[PDB]
Structure formats: C-alpha cells, structure tokens
Design a protein around this nucleic acid. Structure first.
Lengths: 531, 499
DNA sequence: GGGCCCTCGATCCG
DNA sequence: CGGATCGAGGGCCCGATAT
C-alpha cells in the first residue's frame, strides 16, 4: 500500500498572526505536519511525501504562465521522506510575508502528483491543505480543479485553525478536547473560503466529504491524517461451523489489537557502537546446594507435579501432548446475551467475523445468523483455533449490525483453570463503611459535575472519546528520537504540552468539578497509615 | 510472602455414610471428592500451600498425642500425586467400603480434642504460615447435643483458635430436616468484620465452589493510588480475578542425579573476553544510514509520563462503552484501607452512586514507574450471591481496558447483503432449539488437562497416560439429533446453490 | 516476505 | 517472591525463479 501525499501548507503572513493564548496557525500547522512526517519517517513506509508552501516571499513553482501561482514554493519534491526534511520543518522553514491563493497552491500540488507518479507508482493519491483561509482567492478554475482531482483520483483533506463543526453547533489548549478554537476568530473572508472548501469536499466525496475538514488541534489528537494512506488490514479465511450441513465459510480479521513498538533497542558498545562486539553465553551450574557446572549434553528436561519432580524429555512430550483437531470456528451452542458478562473476556484481540468476499450464499447464511441472534437477544458460544498447532479457545460470538456493515464479533472467554474465586467483604451492608446521606449527595453532585457526555438533537455526544486519541507512546518516542538525531549534545526534551492537553479531560469538566471536589474533600476524610 | 496452611477436617459418623435420601453421593463421598479436586488444583496452580486431611469419630486413632477417635491421614505437607492416590482409595461406594474396613466409623468423638490436635498440627510447621485455616466437613448440625461438657469445651477451644489467628470455616452438608447453624457452628466459626453464611451444600459442584471461594486468601496484584484530584487520593488494590493459566515451565535436570540445574546467562565482549559492565553498554536504533544512540536511562526516560496509580478523568455513561473494544483482560478494583484510611467510605459512596446513575469512572491507568498511560473505565460491579449464597460477583469496580486510536484496526469494506425474514425466522428456530446455559467454569483447558493427566500418569511410573477429552468440541451428534429436518429445510432455503 | 503463534528469558513488584 | 513483555524460535502463502 503505497501512496503519493503532497502537503500544501500556507506560510503566509496571516498564518503568523497569532491570537492570545493560541499558538499561531503557522506553528499549529507546523506541529501537525511534523506529527505526520515523523510517523511516516520512523515506521519507514514507502508512501512518498512532497511539501508545497504557499505565501512564501519567493516563487519556485512549475506553473508560472502569466505570473500565475506566484509566492508558492515546492520545498520538497515527491520522494521518500528523510531526516533532512524533518530538520528543515523544525527550524529551516520560516513564515513568509505575502499571501497566496490556496486553490492555486492546490493546483501546484496536483501538478506534482500528475508528473511524479508516472508508471502507476502510487496506489492512492492524496493532498493535505493546511491554511487559515484568511487570504483572498479566485473562483476561476474551481470547476477544473475538481475535474482534475477526480480524473487523477486524488483525495483531499483540509486543516484549519478553527473547526467548522462547533461553529455550526453554536481559555484555549492545543490538542485539548472542546475549546480548541476561538468562536470569535473567523472572519467573513474565512467564512467565504470555508463555503468553497465545503462545496469542493462535497463535490469530491459526497455528503460525508465534510468529515475530512479538521482543525489543527483535533488533528493532533487523532490519526485522521493517515486515514487515506492507512494500509488495509490483513484478513484470513476459516469456516464457522454451526453444525452439520449448517457450517458457514467466513473470513475474520483482528478488529482490535494492541499496537506495540515497531523498532527494538539493539545493545551496542559505548565506544565502537556495534552489537557484534557484545556476545551472550549461557552457563549451567547446579541449582542445588552445590553450584558445579553442568554439562550441556547431560542436561535432561523435567517437569514438576506438586512436590514430585518427574523427568519428561521433549521427545516424549511431543508424542504424549494434546493434539488439537485443527483450526475451526465450531459453535458449541447459543445462550442469552445476559449470560456472557464483559468481566469474563479473555485474550489480547477481538475478531470481526465477516462473510467471505465474493460469496453470496455465505453472505446470506451469515446475515441470517446475525439477525437471528440480534432479534432474539442471544449470543453464540464457539470453539476457536487459528491453526492445528494453536491452542484451542472458547469464546463469545455476538451480533453487530450497523447501516453500512454487518458482522459477528468474537471475544475469547475463560477456561475453568483461568477463573479465580476470592471472597471480598460486602459493602452494601458494611456497618463500618456505610456513607452518610450528605456524603452520598456530595458524590452525586461530583458525578453530575464531572460527566463526560453531552446528550434540540437529544443525541449523546461523547466529550472524551478515548478510542479516537492515539497512544502517546509513539509520538513521544518519535519526538525524542528526532531530538537526539538532530541535537545530540542536548538532553532529551520534555513531553510536549499538546500531548498532556490531549490526554486530560476538557477544561469545562475540570472547571465544573472544582466545587464538588472541595466539598467531598472535607466530607471524605483521608489519612495516611503509619502506626 | 509465606506458605499457607489448610487443614481438611471430615466427620466420619454414621450420618456421614447416609446418602440422606437423595441421588447425590453421601456427604463422606462428597467430601473425599472435593478434597481430591482441591489437591489437584493446588498442584496445577503455582502455590506452595500446605494441605492436611484429618478425620474424627473413627475407631482407629492415629495422632500426635494419641487422642481417642482422631485419625490424621495426612500431616500438613505439600500436595502430591501419592497423596491424591491415597484419597482415591475412599472415593465412591467402593471407596466407602475401603474406608469402613481400614478405620471404623460412628464412634463417640470430642470436638475439643479434635481442634486441639488440628492446632497442634499447625504448631509443627517451620515455614511462616501466612494463613491458618480449618475446613470442617460435617452434616451434624448439633454435635454434643446430649453432652453439655463436650459442647462447652469445644466452644472454648474454638475461641482459643480464633484468638490464635486460625480461620474456622464450616462445610455443612445435607441433613434430614435441614442444617441449623443456630444449634451449632454459629459460635465456633470465624466470622468477618463485614458480616451471613452460605446455605447447606447438596451437590459436589456447590461444595467445591464454596470451598474454592475461601480456598486462597485474596492476593492483590498491585496496590496503587487512586487520585480523584491533586489533594483527594484514596488507595486501591488491583486484583486479577481472571488470569490465563499456562503450562508450567520445564526444569533443566542432570542425566544421573536428576537434580535441578541453575542457568547463568553471562554477557561479555568479543574483543576482550571479560565480563562487560552495564555502563559500557548503549542502545542503538538504525534508520537507513543514520544511527540513533540512547542510554538505558534515556530509553526509560522516554517511557516516563505519569506516576504509578489511577487518575480519575471523569464519568462516562456505560452506553458509550462498547462491548467490542476489548484490549486485554479486565481487572478488579477494591479499596485498600490498610494504606489510606477512609478510602473504603469514598469507594462505597462512589460505587453506589455510579450504579444508581449507570455511569463508569474513566481513569488514566499507569501500573508501574516509567510506563506510558492507558485509559481504563472502572465499571460499577454489584454484589451477586447464588442460591447457595456464594459470591458470584464481588462488589467493586471492573477495570476495563480501553484501546487507543492505534489499537483499532481498519476494516476491509464488504457490501451489506441482508437476509429475508423467512431465513432469519428459520435461523431463529435453529437458535431456539440449540439454546443452552453458559457457565464460566463449563470448559476445562484440554492442553492443561492433558499435560497434568500425563504428569500424573508418568508420576505413578506405571500409569499409562490419562487422555483428557477436549470439552471445547461440540456435541455434533446430539445437535444433529436435536435438529434433523430443520437443517436440511434451512439448507435448501438459505443455501440453494450447490458448490 | 508477511502474519501468525508459542515458548523462554529478562524486568520489575507483592 | 507472578505478570507483562519482548526477542527468537517455529510453520503456511506468494512474486521471482532456474527449470
């Protein structure tokens, strides 16, 4: 999954105009661009990235007929991003004093894609515009811009300092949830530019095209910037066995799977800086009273059976061990939804069981089971194994129907051995810990004040969707890795403020909680243990 | 840390050999099988706990101070294959005959002397006993009802045991006309600060579930600070109520002595050959031509974000938390009054009001130092007691791990094809006919069952190996019997093509 | 070559 | 003194491959 991405950044004087408390849109866009490039650089994906700046003091562009598309510089041509590009964004690129037409810059970006993609090199074509729309513009070639974008199959994404969505709906902390743009900062000229941006996005991707216009703040606390260049998830086939004659061939993929560190820390010598100079040798000495060195060949395999230690060699183990019947998704039975509690969920993944692609009979056969379980409010207890070598699993398979897709969701359940039974003291009737009516009414006011949901529309809006926030581990690692690559003498930099701002709840919740927290502090006594 | 001591006390009176007019095995048979099951589980689990089996009311007496009618079958010692084999000689109707032949039954006993011998059994242990516990399996609701002296002396010795730190738990068994705690066992048993008692056991599954609940003392995975705000901080204990049971790691032995071998993994230089200090080592990551060098301290410093503990973010209504957003197994949050006094009161108030408003407490969980945070949702879990009054759901919060944007994987877009209402109605009939009752303990790990069945068999050095049957496999034939016509009818209606 | 899975080994707390 | 995690093992699909 390759893709040609061209980042069209407005560097015009108006990008330098900063509103009190808020970082200037130039620095905001810079932070977003650096965020994108860092991910593309350190994971070493083959998508090629180009950088066009509009509103520069000079003019470096391939379209210059009749002094057209002036003050637009193609700083970086379409090629694999490197550390030199990241260093230039960090400090070399400075804001300009002129203003350019953002649509003209979009045309410059389009010419880059049109010429540097020769030979069907890229699977996807994408342009990301970073502007404030405060600059005047011409509506002359909009019809052609849209036509060239469709014929070339190039997708767009707009990034503004303010968001449109809370604009229509109606302190500042970048990356924070909620108040992340002045409602009083949009100008009639910005509104005029916005209407054209909206129309263009709708002309390209329909009604849902409008979802691709973000604010720099929210862009920093989302992975939407990679959306168009994200590599398709690897899916695999198996057969869901609902019984004899009732077995359905399916294709499942990992819906949820913990994204972990791609790069590993290699141990090298402080002087030579090579791993080869370091070597690990294993030594065997007796564990018992005496520590004599044990011969590697004379070492025999053994296993403990309580007090007794029985010697069981690996050779006999492979023969005597449990041989799994093979990979399958056989249904053991069906039970009501209430019987399967989320506290019993096991494993480190969630599987989305979809109907086999280009198979109509299996698509209908699975849809029938999904709707039968949904209408009856029931689930399916199934047996799963990815391969004949993998250990068998027992889990839940529940329906999941939305307007666009239809699927079953598999989550591994526990075995008798996995379950643990402890007895905890009751609190419902704890004479010693029962809270007073005032204490309870204080927690009642605290929970009402610290609510993370907003329900005109009468629809519930989540104010802290954590599933949309990216894992701070990655952008923090990229920050430190780049800082050491560019400034080796300087020590590691501190956590960037926007990362803390995106991890903390919206300012309105923190402010609302102040009073009930102070009342519960006095109502709820806290004391340290010493004696 | 310390080794836990557990003593199983079994009544051997005439009533215990009575199947008290039901199809279930007699309380003695129930006890012996329950004991055996605990022994095997203790071998499976990674616990050093010491077990013991004591009988009372037997003609033959075998004990430390030769008290009449007390047979200590097994002293406090580690669980073994040979010990389970000895218990197997009493299992069943055939085992009951073997018990009556080996030792007598229905003889006059004295509970005072019985507890005295048991206490003397803990006396003889050298390793530190973290918890001392006696589990009395009996179906006599009022022992020494006729003898006033034996009853008062037993009440006194039970008090002496509770003052020592020994836990006394009753395993009351089926009694004609019910089992009454008020007659006896009400004062002897060790009760709890937070209160009352499980009901009498009729099935082995119930006895085993009650035994296994008080089997092992709650072991907290971690003790962290739950910071409501910079100044309001309560202390909570994180418990793993579900934990993947894995195959025990092998031990490297010697071909002749068959004694364990210690592994020493030494890392040293190539140019010099001598052991290298950790100060002389550095960490590197190479991207193309560039090589980034970081010290071990720097590699950990970048990991640094929050201090260990839970940071309350706010309150999200449960409806927003989706069932398909599971990342890693959930934990259990319970207060820890031992560290911060007054934690339990605020915890109780929070749990009660969260259940009332049907809202979960969103926190930023950081388990250890220099570890990146993760957003967790503490879902209010209400207490549930089954008909035997065994706590199926403890009261507290379930720490539900929530995934970050990175953990949600993109999905391959397929076209929505919806089934006709006739096909769904037919699948409804299939589901309704294959309906069954799911239990968390319904299935046993076949790999583990086979591994320990193999070790048991190799352990008797004569046993052929014990073939565990995979419970995860479906009752194919039973299902085909349940649905015969329906399957072919539906197959013709939903799968009309051949292929 | 890419995803998968399992088994140890090294890292820290109870 | 157990979990969680992370290398480094193992076994099936698939574009270049000498055949």
């Amino acid at each position: 999954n390759k893709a040609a991405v061209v980042l069209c950044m407005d560097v015009g004087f108006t990008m330098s105009n900063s509103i009190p408390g808020i970082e200037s849109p130039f620095e905001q866009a810079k932070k977003v661009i650096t965020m994108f490039v860092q991910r593309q650089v350190f994971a070493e994906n083959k998508d090629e990235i180009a950088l066009v700046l509009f509103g520069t003091d000079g003019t470096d562009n391939p379209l210059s007929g009749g002094d057209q598309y002036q003050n637009i510089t193609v700083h970086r041509h379409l090629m694999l991003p490197d550390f030199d590009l990241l260093e230039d964004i960090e400090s070399k690129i400075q804001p300009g004093s002129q203003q350019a037409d953002f649509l003209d810059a979009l045309i410059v970006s389009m010419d880059v894609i049109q010429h540097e993609t020769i030979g069907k090199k890229f699977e996807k074509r994408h342009i990301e515009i970073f502007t404030d729309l405060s600059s005047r513009f011409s509506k002359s070639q909009l019809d052609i811009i849209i036509h060239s974008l469709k014929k070339c199959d190039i997708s767009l994404q707009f990034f503004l300092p303010f968001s449109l969505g809370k604009e229509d709906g109606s302190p500042f902390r970048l990356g924070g949830h909620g108040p992340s743009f002045p409602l009083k900062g949009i100008t009639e000229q910005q509104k005029e530019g916005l209407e054209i941006v909206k129309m263009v996005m709708i002309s390209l991707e329909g009604e849902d095209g409008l979802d691709e216009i973000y604010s720099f703040s929210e862009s920093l606390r989302k992975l939407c910037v990679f959306k168009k260049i994200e590599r398709h998830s690897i899916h695999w086939p198996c057969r869901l066995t609902i019984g004899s004659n009732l077995s359905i061939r399916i294709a499942a993929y990992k819906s949820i799977l913990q994204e972990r560190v791609k790069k590993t820390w290699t141990v090298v010598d402080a002087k030579t800086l090579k791993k080869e100079d370091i070597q690990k040798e294993t030594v065997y000495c007796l564990n018992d009273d005496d520590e004599t060195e044990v011969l590697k060949e004379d070492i025999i395999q053994g296993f403990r059976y309580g007090s007794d230690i029985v010697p069981f060699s690996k050779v006999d183990e492979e023969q005597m061990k449990y041989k799994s019947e093979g990979k399958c998704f056989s249904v053991l039975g069906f039970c009501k939804s209430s019987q399967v509690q989320r506290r019993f969920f096991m494993g480190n993944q969630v599987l989305k069981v979809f109907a086999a692609r280009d198979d109509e009979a299996a698509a209908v056969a699975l849809s029938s089971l999904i709707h039968a379980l949904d209408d009856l409010d029931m689930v399916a207890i199934v047996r799963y194994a990815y391969d004949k070598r993998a250990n068998p699993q027992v889990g839940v398979a529940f329906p999941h129907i939305k307007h666009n897709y239809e699927c079953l969701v598999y989550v591994q359940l526990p075995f008798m051995e996995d379950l643990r039974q402890y007895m905890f003291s009751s609190l419902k009737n704890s004479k010693k810990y029962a809270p007073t009516e005032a204490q309870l009414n204080a927690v009642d006011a605290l929970i009402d004040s610290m609510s993370l949901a907003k329900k005109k529309t009468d629809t519930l809006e989540d104010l802290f969707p954590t599933t949309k926030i990216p894992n701070p581990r990655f952008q923090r690692l990229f920050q430190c890795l780049l800082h050491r690559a560019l400034h080796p003498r300087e020590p590691l930099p501190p956590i960037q403020q926007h990362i803390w701002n995106m991890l903390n709840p919206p300012a309105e919740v923190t402010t609302k909680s102040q009073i009930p927290l102070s009342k519960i502090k006095t109502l709820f006594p806290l004391i340290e243990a010493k004696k | 840390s310390g080794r836990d001591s557990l003593i199983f006390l079994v009544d051997a009176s005439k009533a215990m050999f009575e199947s008290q007019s039901e199809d279930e095995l007699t309380p003695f048979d129930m006890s012996i099988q329950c004991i055996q099951s605990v022994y095997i589980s203790k071998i499976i689990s990674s616990d050093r706990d010491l077990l013991a089996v004591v009988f009372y009311g037997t003609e033959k007496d075998k004990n430390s101070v030769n008290f009449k009618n007390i047979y200590v079958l097994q002293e406090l010692d580690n669980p073994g294959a040979k010990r389970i084999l000895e218990l197997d000689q009493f299992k069943g109707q055939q085992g009951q005959k073997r018990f009556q032949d080996m030792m007598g039954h229905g003889s006059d006993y004295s509970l005072s002397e019985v507890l005295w011998v048991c206490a003397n059994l803990f006396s003889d242990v050298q390793f530190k006993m973290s918890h001392k516990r006696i589990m009395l399996f009996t179906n006599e609701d009022n022992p020494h009802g006729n003898d006033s002296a034996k009853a008062s002396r037993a009440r006194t010795k039970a008090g002496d045991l509770r003052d020592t730190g020994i836990f006394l738990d009753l395993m009351h068994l089926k009694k004609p006309g019910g089992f009454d705690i008020s007659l006896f066992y009400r004062d002897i048993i060790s009760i709890a600060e937070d209160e009352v008692h499980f009901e009498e056991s009729s099935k082995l599954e119930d006895l085993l579930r009650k035994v296994r609940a008080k089997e092992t003392r709650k072991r907290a995975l971690s003790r962290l600070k739950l910071k409501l705000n910079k100044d309001i901080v309560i202390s909570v204990g994180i418990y793993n109520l579900v934990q993947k049971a894995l195959k025990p790691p092998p031990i490297k032995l010697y071909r002749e002595t068959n004694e364990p071998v210690k592994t020493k993994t030494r890392t040293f230089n190539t140019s010099t050959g001598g052991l290298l200090l950790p100060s002389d080592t550095k960490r590197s990551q190479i991207y193309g031509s560039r090589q980034i060098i970081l010290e071990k301290e720097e590699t950990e410093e970048l990991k640094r974000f929050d201090d260990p503990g839970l940071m309350l973010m706010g309150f999200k209504p449960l409806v927003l938390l989706k069932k398909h957003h599971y990342l890693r197994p959930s934990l259990f949050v319970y207060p820890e009054e031992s560290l911060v006094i007054g934690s339990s009161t605020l915890f109780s108030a929070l749990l009660i009001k969260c259940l009332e408003k049907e809202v979960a407490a969103l926190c930023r969980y950081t388990p250890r130092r220099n570890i990146p945070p993760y957003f967790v949702a503490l879902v209010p879990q209400e207490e549930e007691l089954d008909d035997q009054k065994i706590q199926v759901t403890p009261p507290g919060f379930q720490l539900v791990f929530l995934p970050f944007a990175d953990d949600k994987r993109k999905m391959p877009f397929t076209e929505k094809i919806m089934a006709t209402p006739e096909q769904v109605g037919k699948m409804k009939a299939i589901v309704e006919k294959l309906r069954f009752t799911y239990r968390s303990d319904s299935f046993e790990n076949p790999v583990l069952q086979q591994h320990f069945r193999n070790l048991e068999a190799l352990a008797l050095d004569l046993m052929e190996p014990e073939q565990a049957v995979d419970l995860t496999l479906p009752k194919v034939e039973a299902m085909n019997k349940r649905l015969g016509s329906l399957v072919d009818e539906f197959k013709e209606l939903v799968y009309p093509p051949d292929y």
